[PDB]
């Protein structure tokens, strides 16, 4: 079964739109036979009915509310009120019931088994296109730790994020990534930006393991015509079609 209880894939949904992503992401991990646990961090902005749909896919639906005065990140939010989503995402480090996790954004899709990511150590991530001496925070291998979590809150508090989101803050904290230990550089096929050199895709693209739907318009923002199995608007369109295939075929029949 999903017998590797000490390790997990972890995602985040702040609303019902992103929950659809999480549902496709979780489904895709199970379709490729992960033995690890599946965890989604959900905010109270996700509806009760959606939370129950998430429980049909994830082993743990964990509520995170940074607006709660009892939440560990709440005092940081009062200093940095623009960082609500980021501070929520950072709660991934609080999941100390696991020795090692791979965080994945809810706008990612798994195309092959990536259980080999658990061979990696904190902080392993793939390079960001556009500024490749920063890693992209859509997919990363980390070790839950209260110490680490509080150090991240400390940084967020004192300096904010240089990009207003989590990537800036994680790159600043884990600032040795670009120059130390090549094994912490995940291959780009573990976090393949849908924005990404066409001739490079032509030769390396078939080996993609994870696609990351970056940019404003997410897969669930597309109007899908199920009849034609297409969308209305897509450089390598197979991925968006795959997303909608998983959603209509594997996600929809789960709450009945």
Asked if residue 119 binds a copy of itself (CB under 8 A), the reply is no
107 binds Mn ion (CB under 5 A): yes
Q: Which does 187 bind (CB under 5 to 8 A by kind): a copy of itself, Mn ion, none?
A: a copy of itself
Our CB check for a copy of itself shows the closer of 22 and 125 to be: 125
Q: Indicate which single residue of 70, 197, 226, 233 sits in contact with a copy of itself (rule: CB under 8 A).
A: 197
- Spatial separation of the C-alpha atoms in residues 11 and 15, rounded to whole Å: 13
Q: With CB under 5 A as the contact rule, which of the stretches 31-39, 69-77, 105-113, 187-195 interacts with Mn ion?
A: 105-113
Which H or E run includes 151?
Answer: helix 146-159
The answer on whether 190 is annotated among ligand-binding residues is: no
Q: What are phi and psi of 19, to 5 degrees?
A: -55, -40
Q: For residue 212, how many other CB atoms are within 10 A of its CB?
A: 23
**Which of 31, 11, 30, 8 shows the shortest CA–CA distance to 21?**
11
φ/ψ of 125, rounded to 5, equals: -160, 160
Measure the CA–CA gap between 112 and 196, rounded to whole angstroms.
19
Which residue, 200 or 254, has its beta carbon nearer to a copy of itself?
Answer: 200
DSSP 69: T
Rule CB under 8 A: choose which of 85, 112, 178, 242 binds a copy of itself: 178
Q: Judged by CB, which is closer to Mn ion: 199, or 226?
A: 199
Q: Does 128 bind a copy of itself (CB under 8 A)?
A: yes
Q: How far is the CB of 6 from Mn ion (least distance, A)?
A: 26
CB-wise, 26 or 138, nearer to Mn ion?
A: 138
Reduced to 3 states (helix: H, G, I; strand: E, B; else coil), residue 154 is: helix
Q: CA 66 to CA 28: how far, in whole Å?
A: 29
The contact set with a copy of itself (CB under 8 A) reads 126-134, 162-164, 168, 178-182, 185, 187-189, 196-197, 199-204
């Amino acid at each position: 079964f999903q017998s590797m209880t000490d390790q997990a894939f972890v995602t985040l949904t702040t609303n019902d739109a992103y929950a659809k992503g999480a549902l496709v992401l979780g489904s895709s991990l199970k379709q490729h036979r992960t033995t690890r646990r599946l965890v989604v961090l959900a905010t109270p902005q996700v509806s009760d009915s959606m939370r129950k749909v998430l429980e049909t896919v994830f082993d743990e639906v964990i509520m995170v509310d940074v607006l709660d005065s009892g939440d560990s990140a709440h005092l940081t939010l009062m200093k940095r009120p623009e960082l609500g989503v980021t501070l929520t995402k950072l709660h991934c480090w609080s999941l100390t019931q696991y020795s090692k996790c791979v965080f994945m954004d809810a706008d990612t899709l798994v195309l092959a088994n990536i259980d080999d990511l658990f061979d990696r150590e904190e902080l392993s991530a793939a390079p960001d296109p556009g500024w490749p001496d920063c890693f992209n925070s859509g997919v990363f291998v980390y070790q839950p730790s209260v110490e680490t979590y509080n150090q991240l809150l400390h940084l967020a508090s004192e300096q904010g994020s240089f990009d207003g989101g989590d990537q800036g803050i994680l790159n600043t904290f884990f600032s040795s990534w670009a120059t130390t230990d090549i094994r912490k550089h995940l291959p780009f096929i573990y976090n393949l930006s849908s924005i990404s050199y066409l001739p490079a895709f032509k030769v390396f693209g078939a080996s993609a393991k994870v696609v990351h739907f970056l940019g404003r318009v997410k897969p669930w923002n597309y109007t899908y015509d199920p009849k034609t199995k297409s969308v209305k608007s897509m450089t390598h369109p197979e991925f968006l079609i795959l997303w909608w295939n998983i959603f209509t075929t594997n996600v929809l029949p789960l709450l009945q």
